[PDB]
Structure formats: structure tokens, C-alpha cells
Ligand binder design. Structure first.
Ligand SMILES: *[C@@H]1O[C@H](CO)[C@@H](O[C@@H]2O[C@H](CO)[C@@H](O)[C@H](O)[C@H]2NC(C)=O)[C@H](O)[C@H]1NC(C)=O
Ligand SMILES: *[C@@H]1O[C@H](CO)[C@@H](O[C@@H]2O[C@H](CO)[C@@H](O)[C@H](O)[C@H]2NC(C)=O)[C@H](O)[C@H]1NC(C)=O
Ligand SMILES: *[C@@H]1O[C@H](CO)[C@@H](O[C@@H]2O[C@H](CO)[C@@H](O)[C@H](O)[C@H]2NC(C)=O)[C@H](O)[C@H]1NC(C)=O
Ligand SMILES: *[C@@H]1O[C@H](CO)[C@@H](O[C@@H]2O[C@H](CO)[C@@H](O)[C@H](O)[C@H]2NC(C)=O)[C@H](O)[C@H]1NC(C)=O
Ligand SMILES: *[C@@H]1O[C@H](CO)[C@@H](O[C@@H]2O[C@H](CO)[C@@H](O)[C@H](O)[C@H]2NC(C)=O)[C@H](O)[C@H]1NC(C)=O
Ligand SMILES: *[C@@H]1O[C@H](CO)[C@@H](O[C@@H]2O[C@H](CO)[C@@H](O)[C@H](O)[C@H]2NC(C)=O)[C@H](O)[C@H]1NC(C)=O
Ligand SMILES: *[C@@H]1O[C@H](CO)[C@@H](O[C@@H]2O[C@H](CO)[C@@H](O)[C@H](O)[C@H]2NC(C)=O)[C@H](O)[C@H]1NC(C)=O
Ligand SMILES: *[C@@H]1O[C@H](CO)[C@@H](O)[C@H](O)[C@H]1NC(C)=O
Ligand SMILES: *[C@@H]1O[C@H](CO)[C@@H](O)[C@H](O)[C@H]1NC(C)=O
Ligand SMILES: *[C@@H]1O[C@H](CO)[C@@H](O)[C@H](O)[C@H]1NC(C)=O
Lengths: 316, 230, 79, 37
């Protein structure tokens, strides 16, 4: 499991801090570019999230489609390929993953832009990659796709790890049965424990916690006589209420600065993980890796990618 | 060799025009330069901000409120400017971490692509990787990955193995392909058919076990020489 | 700011209210990213459409067919 | 697989390598050449 993106948040720095108060907005303007710099940084990390998904999934120039006459030499990819029966094109393991991750509402100032690629499009891209690695082996990742019968493709993959071809064909039934059993076992393996999807759910929870802490900060006062600006303007005349308003301004802006710094750090971390996911998508599924532990415990054969909410799920 | 040389020369030529014509080719470096210059400018521009004081000019504070009270305005300005410098330094630290990650990736690319040949299928551009050349850039490095992209594929009908006197022959390197009536063995990445021989193949097991075998005769180069000397 | 309140070119999307760009039933590649899988492009007009993820290509497949190249092309790629 | 001169290559005399052990290695060419010449 690898996370690739987090919710694209944005905050109206001026509107958030001053809370519709026009005079407070006029006072805050004296600070200069703080409210522009924060918005710019949030936008910058917001765009990067689309970049991460486009880098991880859009590895293929065309959308391949698996053949109708399914005769993959006894291998049964039913649990991995897309399911026509569902209203969405999601595959059964993809459906289980989408169910296993659960919740960012409307607030004051905050907004969550939708991702550039919807779940349907990402599932379509993953189906394209899956059909490509099923019918065409590894060629389609480095040129025009060349069809090759799947049992022969697996026979050549064995030849890539030092086991001669004839060990596969003479054991094709056993290989097929083991592969089908493992693929079928992945579903109940994921369904077994809520801790299986720890990374993606942890990413969502951390984002929600940061957002809640940012919103909850409004109830504080930072040494002012009250938390609501209207009360400040009611109690004192402007020459004296200006100090209280400045106090609230510094407090709220410090809170927003802390939130933005946290988001920048988390953006760097998640972008590192998205680059790792892109490397794995490029190397494992599109090809084969001689990196003895980069793609699962053991000698490596082709993998299959699967889309998950805010991440990927590889079947090494 | 002639065709490879002509294609390589044409590509190394066309890359120059590709860089020249496109106005946004080098965006990854211009982004760094623009971000650094913009951060510095917005730092300096913040110097003239007020931060809630009677003035933004330092000396004016020293000549308009007297030492007993101008210290408060001075302190407010001090806190504002120090906070702005804090934000600039933190942004610089995060961006420097990002550039360090990029530079480590570039170092790995240099070591693997330029100094050797990398089997990582999509680490060095589309297609199988042959070699690469580095080129210096004002704040980065520009590679020229030279990749082998196959083209002009065509259909063939194969079998996983060849049966001949009941012994399951397999290809030593490559894959059996048929043009419709005959059979041939070929390297897996280029169509150079060669007549099937006991040296081009190897044997194991026997007929009944493999799933897609076909019937054909396998040449034996020792037989003609032996029959020549009876 | 009453400008661009015309009703002849007011559109609604999951990404938000979109004004001026005329919606089309066709599909193309990415030109300008609106949110939620809609992209806007120029043509004597501006259009906004749902993304196309690359032309569909189906590989002819069977249990006994292969395809091996008969030629190569060298190429150079910057990074 | 039974040892043959086809899946085995030759280097040097029998002394220089430690752990060397004696055995026969079948030849897929000698019987037929002897049979037919
Ligand atoms: C491939 O695996 C799928 C598993 O999804 C098999 O589908 C099952 O088929 C049996 C018998 O037809 C049904 O009773 C089950 O309800 C199906 N689903 C599951 C989840 O078990 C399928 O039969 C297998 N074989 C082929 C050729 O597709
Ligand atoms: C290699 O191991 C596999 C199991 O990993 C063996 O397959 C099992 O064989 C037994 C007895 O024939 C069956 O009862 C099981 O149902 C088989 N399991 C599977 C998943 O196929 C296989 O027989 C072993 N090979 C040899 C030569 O003994
Ligand atoms: C398939 O390959 C066979 C190779 O034997 C071709 O048959 C040969 O064609 C050449 C054409 O000049 C003749 O000179 C040879 O005499 C043929 N072989 C024999 C044994 O007669 C055949 O033409 C090829 N067919 C296709 C469709 O590619
Ligand atoms: C590939 O699939 C085809 C069709 O499903 C198989 O063709 C059948 O093969 C059997 C055994 O040789 C014949 O008895 C039938 O008459 C064939 N039917 C048709 C419609 O061709 C073929 O055997 C399969 N080959 C492999 C290697 O799986
Ligand atoms: C490939 O050749 C084998 C051997 O010549 C064929 O198997 C024979 O088929 C005939 C059919 O009348 C039987 O009488 C023999 O007993 C079979 N011999 C053996 C050893 O199986 C086989 O049918 C051929 N297959 C194809 C597709 O040509
Ligand atoms: C492989 O492709 C190259 C082009 O990429 C072909 O080279 C061309 O060949 C024709 C006919 O001889 C010439 O008129 C062109 O000038 C060649 N182009 C270049 C760039 O040299 C080559 O013929 C192809 N190989 C095969 C076997 O068809
Ligand atoms: C393996 O073969 C070698 C070579 O024939 C043997 O070495 C000879 O052993 C005899 C034993 O009586 C000595 O008299 C010879 O001097 C040895 N050398 C030569 C060149 O003949 C060796 O003994 C055999 N056995 C083992 C276990 O190595
Ligand atoms: C193989 O033949 C089929 C059917 O004629 C065709 O659709 C396919 O394009 C051919 N293969 C290639 C690589 O063109
Ligand atoms: C476009 O598609 C929609 C939905 O299928 C349909 O209602 C409409 O008539 C089509 N044509 C135009 C011009 O909108
Ligand atoms: C090491 O191998 C040699 C023969 O190759 C043998 O004589 C010796 O006993 C071995 N040593 C040990 C500790 O097994």
C-alpha cells in the first residue's frame, strides 16, 4: 500500500482571519504579503497533488482493453480485472478497497478542490495498465504493445529469474492453481483486519485532524477579552479595540502559519511516497525487477496495480 | 551500422531544435530560479510593511514618539520583521529539502545511466536503454537518454514447444514463431528467423505433458557431416 | 461585477459554476485543468469537455499468437 | 540432467582447483561417430 495524494485544501486567509469584519480586514492589510504567501503555498501544494496522480497512473499513452474471449491458459484474473456488473468499472478488490476506507465539510474560509482525476478515470487508467500487462507482458511499457500468449509470457518471466522455461510448461496446472488460490486469498486477506489499510486511513485522519485543529482555534482568544470580533467592537471604541483586534489577528495568523507549515511538511512526505509509487509502477508492473526486495518477499514476477482512495495497492 | 548511425545523428540533431522552439521546455529549472527570486523580492517588499505601527520607516519612529514610548513601536516592528524572516527561512529550508531530493535522484541517474546501463525499465526514458549523455544546465543537469524503441511489429502464430520424435524441444534463447507453413526460432526482440537446430534448442521431458506443442522436424547438423563420411 | 451574468453561456459542473465556455459532447485531451475531470480549450470560442484518457487501442490476442518487431528506431529523450 | 560435454565447459588441468572430484562425463558425439565414422 502506498499513498499518492491528499485532499486539496485551500483557505481564504483574509476572510478566515477577519471573519467578514470589514474594519478588521482593513487593519490586517497593514501586515502585507502574509495572507498572499500562505494562499500561494497552499495553492502550490494543491497543484502538486494532481501532479502525483498524473505521474503514478498515467504511464501509458493508450487505454488498452482486455480481449472478450478470455483464455489465459488457465490463469483466472476475474478477481483483478474490472467487473462489468457494478455501476462503476471498479474491480472486485478495488471495490473492497473503496469500501474499506471511510471519512472535510463546508466551514468558514476553508475549501476542498476536487481532484483533477475522478475515481472513475483512475480506475480506467488502472484497467488500461492491467490489460497491458496481461496481454502484452512488458513490451507495451517501452514501445508499441506486442501481444503474447499469457502462459508463454509467464514462461519467459521464469527464464528471467534463473528457472528454465521447461519448469513452467510441465507444471502449468500447478502454477495456475497456486496463482488463482493466492489471488482469491488476497480478498479475504484485506477484509480480515481494519489495520490492512493503515497508511491511507492514517493520511486521511491526519489531514482531518489538522483541519479540525485549524478550525477549532477560533474558539480561543490569545489574551483578548473575547473570541468574537463583534464583542470586541461592542465593548470598546476603535482607538482601544484596535489593540484587541491586533491581538486576535496575530493569534489567528500564527495558527494559520503553523497549519500551512505542517501541510508543507506532509506534502513533501507524501510526494516522496508518490515518487516511490511511480518508481514501483514503472519498474515492477511495466517490467521486471532484479532488485531482490524492491517488489515483494521473494523472486519477482509481474505485478498488478489497483486503485485505492488516495493511493495505490500493488499485488506483487 | 549505417542505419543506426543515421538515426542517432538525426535524433541528436532534432533534440536541439526541440529545445530551441519550445518556450516551456526548461520549466523545471526556471521554476526554481523564479521561486528563489520571488521569495527574495517578497522578503524585501515586506520590509516596507507597517505591522501596525505609526510608521514603517525606522528613523521616523526615532523622531516622532521619544524614547519613553517609541520603544513599543520599535518592538512591534521588530517582531513583525523577525516573523517575516522566520517564514522566509522556513520556506527556504523546505525548498532546499526538495532540491536535495531532486539532486539525489539526479546523482542516481548519472551513476546508473551515464556510467553504465540500467535494466530498470522506465528509469531512463521510454524504450529499452542503450546509453546516455549528460549536459550541464545553469541550475541543473540535462540528460540525453538514447533508447531503443522497437517498431513495425507483425503477426505470427507460435507454440510453446516443438515435438520431434516425442521429445519436447524448447527454444534456448527466444521464442518459436511460424510464418504459416514453416517454423523458425528468433531472438525475442528482432525478426531474424533461423532454421531450427538441435544447437538452437534444448530438450526435456517428452511429448504428453506440455499444453500447446506442435509437430515439426528438428534439424541436426551432425547428420550431414556424418553422412558425408558415411 | 454584473459582467458575465449572461444566461446563454452559463454552465454547471461538479467542479463549480463555469461561465462563458460552451459545453460540448465530444472529448479531447487535456488543455486547461478544471477540477473533477473537465478540461477547457480554445476551439473562435472556448469549450469545456470531459477528459479523454488516450485513444482506445485493443491488442488482438489469442492463445497462440505472437508479435515480434521487424525493425527498430533509436531516439533521444531529455530529462 | 546427466552430465555431458554440451552443458559443461573446460578450463585448465585437474590440480589447480580445490574440491575437484572425479567422474565420467558423457559425450553426445563419440558414440555416433564410432558407430558410423
Ligand atoms: C474465476 O474466478 C471467479 C471468481 O470470481 C469464478 O467466479 C465464480 O464462479 C462460480 C461458479 O461459476 C460461482 O459460484 C461464484 O459465485 C463466482 N464468483 C466467486 C467470487 O466465486 C469463476 O468461475 C472462475 N473461472 C472462470 C473461468 O472465470
Ligand atoms: C509442490 O507443492 C505443491 C503445493 O504447494 C503440491 O501441490 C499439492 O499436491 C498435493 C498432492 O498432489 C495436493 O493434494 C494439493 O491439492 C496440491 N496443492 C496445490 C495448490 O496444487 C505439488 O504436488 C508439489 N509438487 C510435487 C512434485 O510434489
Ligand atoms: C515461409 O517461410 C518458408 C521458408 O521455407 C518459405 O518457403 C520458401 O520460400 C522461398 C521463397 O523464395 C523459396 O525459395 C523456398 O524454396 C521455400 N521453401 C521451400 C522448402 O520450398 C515461404 O515462402 C514463407 N511463406 C510466407 C507466407 O512467409
Ligand atoms: C486455443 O483455443 C482454441 C479454441 O478455443 C483451441 O482450438 C481447439 O483445439 C482442440 C485441440 O487441438 C481441437 O480439438 C478443437 O477442434 C479446436 N477448436 C477450435 C475452434 O479451434 C486450441 O486448442 C487452443 N490452443 C491452446 C494452446 O490453448
Ligand atoms: C503429432 O504427431 C504425433 C505422432 O506422429 C501424433 O500422435 C499420433 O496420432 C495418430 C493419429 O492417428 C495415432 O495413431 C498415434 O498413435 C499417435 N502417436 C502418438 C505417439 O501420440 C499427433 O496426433 C500429431 N498431432 C498433430 C497436431 O499433428
Ligand atoms: C527500418 O526503418 C528505417 C527508417 O526508420 C528504414 O530506413 C529507410 O529505408 C528506406 C528504404 O531503403 C529509405 O528510403 C529511407 O531513406 C530509410 N530511412 C532512413 C532514415 O535511413 C529501414 O529500411 C527499415 N528497415 C526495414 C528492414 O524495412
Ligand atoms: C582421481 O583421478 C586422479 C587422476 O587419475 C587420481 O590421481 C592419481 O591417483 C593415483 C592413485 O593410485 C596416483 O598413483 C597418481 O599419482 C595420481 N595422479 C595421477 C596424475 O594419476 C586420483 O587418485 C583420483 N581420485 C581422487 C579421489 O582424486
Ligand atoms: C494481427 O491480425 C489482426 C487481425 O487481422 C489485426 O487486427 C492485428 O492488428 C494484427 N496484429 C498487429 C500487430 O497488427
Ligand atoms: C449531448 O448529450 C446530452 C446527454 O447525453 C444530450 O442531452 C444532448 O442532447 C446532447 N447534445 C447536445 C447538443 O447537448
Ligand atoms: C573441505 O573440503 C575438503 C575437500 O574439498 C575436505 O577434504 C575437507 O574435509 C572439508 N573440510 C570441512 C571442514 O568439511
Amino acid at each position: 500500500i502506498l499513498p499518492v495524494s491528499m485532499t486539496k485544501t485551500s483557505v481564504d486567509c483574509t476572510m478566515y482571519i477577519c471573519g467578514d469584519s470589514t474594519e478588521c480586514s482593513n487593519l490586517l492589510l497593514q501586515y502585507g504579503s502574509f495572507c498572499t504567501q500562505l494562499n500561494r503555498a497552499l495553492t502550490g501544494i494543491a497543484v502538486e497533488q494532481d501532479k502525483n496522480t498524473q505521474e503514478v497512473f498515467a504511464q501509458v499513452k493508450q487505454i488498452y482493453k482486455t480481449p472478450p474471449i478470455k483464455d489465459f491458459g488457465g490463469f483466472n484474473f476475474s478477481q483483478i480485472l474490472p467487473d462489468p456488473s457494478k455501476p462503476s468499472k471498479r474491480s472486485p478488490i478495488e471495490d473492497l478497497l473503496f469500501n474499506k476506507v471511510t471519512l472535510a465539510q463546508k466551514f468558514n474560509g476553508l475549501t476542498v478542490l476536487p481532484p483533477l482525476l475522478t475515481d472513475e478515470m483512475i480506475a480506467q487508467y488502472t484497467s488500461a495498465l492491467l490489460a497491458g500487462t496481461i496481454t502484452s507482458g512488458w513490451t507495451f511499457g517501452a514501445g508499441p504493445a506486442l501481444q503474447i500468449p499469457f502462459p508463454m509470457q509467464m514462461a519467459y518471466r521464469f527464464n528471467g529469474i534463473g528457472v528454465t522455461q521447461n519448469v513452467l510448461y510441465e507444471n502449468q496446472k500447478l502454477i495456475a492453481n497456486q496463482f488463482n488460490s493466492a489471488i482469491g486469498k488476497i480478498q479475504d486477506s484485506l477484509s480480515s483486519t481494519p489495520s490492512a489499510l493503515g497508511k491511507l486511513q492514517d493520511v486521511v485522519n491526519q489531514n482531518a485532524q489538522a483541519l479540525n485543529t485549524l478550525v477549532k482555534q477560533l474558539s480561543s482568544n490569545f489574551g483578548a477579552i473575547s473570541s468574537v470580533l463583534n464583542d470586541i467592537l461592542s465593548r470598546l471604541d476603535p482607538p482601544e479595540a484596535e489593540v484587541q483586534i491586533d491581538r486576535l489577528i496575530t493569534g489567528r495568523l500564527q495558527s494559520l502559519q503553523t497549519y500551512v507549515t505542517q501541510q508543507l511538511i506532509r506534502a513533501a512526505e507524501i510526494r516522496a511516497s508518490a515518487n516511490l509509487a511511480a518508481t514501483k509502477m514503472s519498474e515492477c508492473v511495466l517490467g521486471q525487477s532484479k532488485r531482490v526486495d524492491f517488489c515483494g518477499k521473494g523472486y519477482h514476477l509481474m505485478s498488478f496495480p489497483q486503485s485505492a482512495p488516495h493511493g495505490v495497492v500493488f499485488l506483487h | 551500422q549505417k542505419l543506426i548511425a543515421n538515426q542517432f545523428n538525426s535524433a541528436i540533431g532534432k533534440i536541439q531544435d526541440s529545445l530551441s522552439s519550445t518556450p516551456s521546455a526548461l520549466g523545471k529549472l526556471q521554476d526554481v530560479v523564479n521561486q528563489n527570486a520571488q521569495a527574495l523580492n517578497t522578503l524585501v517588499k515586506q520590509l516596507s510593511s507597517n505591522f501596525g505601527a505609526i510608521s514603517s520607516v525606522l528613523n521616523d519612529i526615532l523622531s516622532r514618539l521619544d524614547p519613553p514610548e517609541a520603544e513599543v513601536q520599535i518592538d512591534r516592528l521588530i517582531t513583525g520583521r523577525l516573523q517575516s524572516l522566520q517564514t522566509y527561512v522556513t520556506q527556504q529550508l523546505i525548498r532546499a529539502a526538495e532540491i536535495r531530493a531532486s539532486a539525489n535522484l539526479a546523482a542516481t541517474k548519472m551513476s546508473e545511466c551515464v556510467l553504465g546501463q540500467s535494466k530498470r525499465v522506465d528509469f531512463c526514458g521510454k524504450g529499452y536503454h542503450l546509453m546516455s549523455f549528460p549536459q550541464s544546465a545553469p541550475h541543473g543537469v540535462v540528460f540525453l537518454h538514447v533508447t531503443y524503441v522497437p517498431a513495425q511489429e507483425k503477426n505470427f502464430t507460435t507454440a510453446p514447444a516443438i515435438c520431434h520424435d516425442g521429445k519436447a524441444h524448447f527454444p534456448r534463447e527466444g521464442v518459436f514463431v511460424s510464418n504459416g507453413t514453416h517454423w523458425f526460432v528468433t531472438q525475442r526482440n528482432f525478426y531474424e528467423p533461423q532454421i531450427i537446430t538441435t544447437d538452437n534448442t534444448f530438450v526435456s521431458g517428452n511429448c504428453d505433458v506440455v499444453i500447446g506443442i506442435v509437430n515439426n522436424t528438428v534439424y541436426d547438423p551432425l547428420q550431414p557431416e556424418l553422412d558425408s563420411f558415411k | 461585477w454584473r459582467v458575465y451574468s449572461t444566461g446563454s453561456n452559463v454552465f454547471q459542473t461538479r467542479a463549480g459554476c463555469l461561465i462563458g465556455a460552451e459545453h460540448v459532447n465530444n472529448s479531447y485531451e487535456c488543455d486547461i485543468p478544471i477540477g473533477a475531470g473537465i478540461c477547457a480549450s480554445y476551439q473562435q470560442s472556448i469549450i469545456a469537455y470531459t477528459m479523454s484518457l488516450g485513444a482506445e487501442n485493443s491488442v488482438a490476442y489469442s492463445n497462440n499468437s505472437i508479435a515480434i518487431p521487424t525493425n527498430f528506431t533509436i531516439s533521444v529523450t531529455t530529462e
